[PDB]
Design a protein around this ligand. Structure first.
Ligand SMILES: CN(CCOc1ccc(C[C@H](Nc2ccccc2C(=O)c2ccccc2)C(=O)O)cc1)c1ccccn1
Lengths: 271, 13
């Protein structure tokens, strides 16, 4: 019973640590200053983005600053670059969820396809405070105000993620809780087009029991925290769907802003 | 057309 659920929780946490370089613990230490590392470079405008380019991981044909003469598109390109790597991290993590790699490979694909952005948005909250988001493994802090100032639809992308994060961060989960929660998101048996749902739901039932136990043990003073966290899963879907519509605006109105093929594959026929 | 997600899922380690 609960014996293996504690082992599962620990296995997931260890895998999470292996898969995600910038944990919530590291990010909070940076965001609160409880680190001996130098303060992240604060990107709050065109000029600061130009000077902080060296802190935004970006490997391309030319430097980030030369991607466009326009700030919004530089941000778009750097964020796309990060998302591709985020997807790869989440995929590695997923493969460590017990049972996951034994599922139909086409179902593994489907679970990843519909789960990765929900997980990205969940984990982005770990990197956020009310005023901005850590970027490039905490190498840069991009202000919420700056992101909101970008011309439409560029300035509409991050604000719903900040609004989600402020409420989600109020739950005060830590990495050990998050490791099980994002496993629960991945193992969702109601993703469209799943070929064989029972094995997925069976895994998710175990993950849900380990999450509930983990939350009770780790947050004894937070009654119904499980119930509160479960109610956020549905918010993530709305964020994804709203993000899709914004990407659709980019696609219908901007030239030369095709997505990385991995993102195109994820988004193709999404919902 | 070959799935990039499949490539990532089949990659070892
Ligand atoms: C904001 N941030 C941290 C990572 O934030 C993420 C925020 C969202 C995502 C998901 C990802 N988003 C995009 C994908 C391609 C291009 C732009 C976006 C944006 O989301 C976007 C668009 C316009 C303005 C701002 C963002 C997706 O859908 O795959 C992944 C990561 C950045 C920003 C610039 C450089 C590096 N770090």
């Amino acid at each position: 019973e609960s014996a293996d659920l504690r082992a599962l929780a620990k296995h997931l946490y260890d895998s999470y640590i292996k898969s995600f370089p910038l944990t919530k613990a590291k990010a909070r230490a940076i965001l609160t200053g409880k680190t001996t590392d130098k303060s992240p470079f604060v990107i709050y405008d065109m000029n600061s983005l130009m000077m902080g380019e060296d802190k935004i991981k970006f490997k391309h044909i030319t430097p980030l600053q030369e991607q466009s003469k326009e700030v919004a598109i530089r941000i778009f390109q750097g964020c796309q670059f990060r998302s591709v790597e985020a997807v790869q991290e989440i995929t590695e993590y997923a493969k460590s969820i017990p049972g996951f790699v034994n599922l139909d490979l086409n179902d593994q694909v489907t679970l990843l396809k519909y789960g990765v952005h929900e997980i990205i948005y969940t984990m982005l909250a770990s990197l956020m405070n009310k005023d901005g988001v850590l970027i490039s493994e905490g190498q840069g802090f991009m202000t919420r105000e700056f992101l909101k100032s970008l011309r439409k639809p560029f300035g509409d992308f991050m604000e719903p993620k900040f609004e989600f994060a402020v409420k989600f961060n109020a739950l005060e989960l830590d990495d050990s809780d998050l490791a099980i929660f994002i496993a629960v998101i991945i193992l969702s048996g109601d993703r469209p087009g799943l070929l064989n749902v029972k094995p997925i739901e069976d895994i998710q039932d175990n993950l849900l029991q380990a999450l509930e136990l983990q939350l009770k043990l780790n947050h004894p003073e937070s009654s119904q925290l499980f119930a509160k966290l479960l109610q956020k899963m549905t918010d993530l879907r709305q964020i994804v769907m709203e993000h899709v519509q914004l990407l659709q605006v980019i696609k219908k109105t901007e030239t030369d802003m095709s997505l990385h093929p991995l993102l195109q594959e994820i988004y193709k026929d999404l919902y | 057309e070959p799935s990039l997600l499949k490539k990532l899922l089949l990659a070892p380690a």
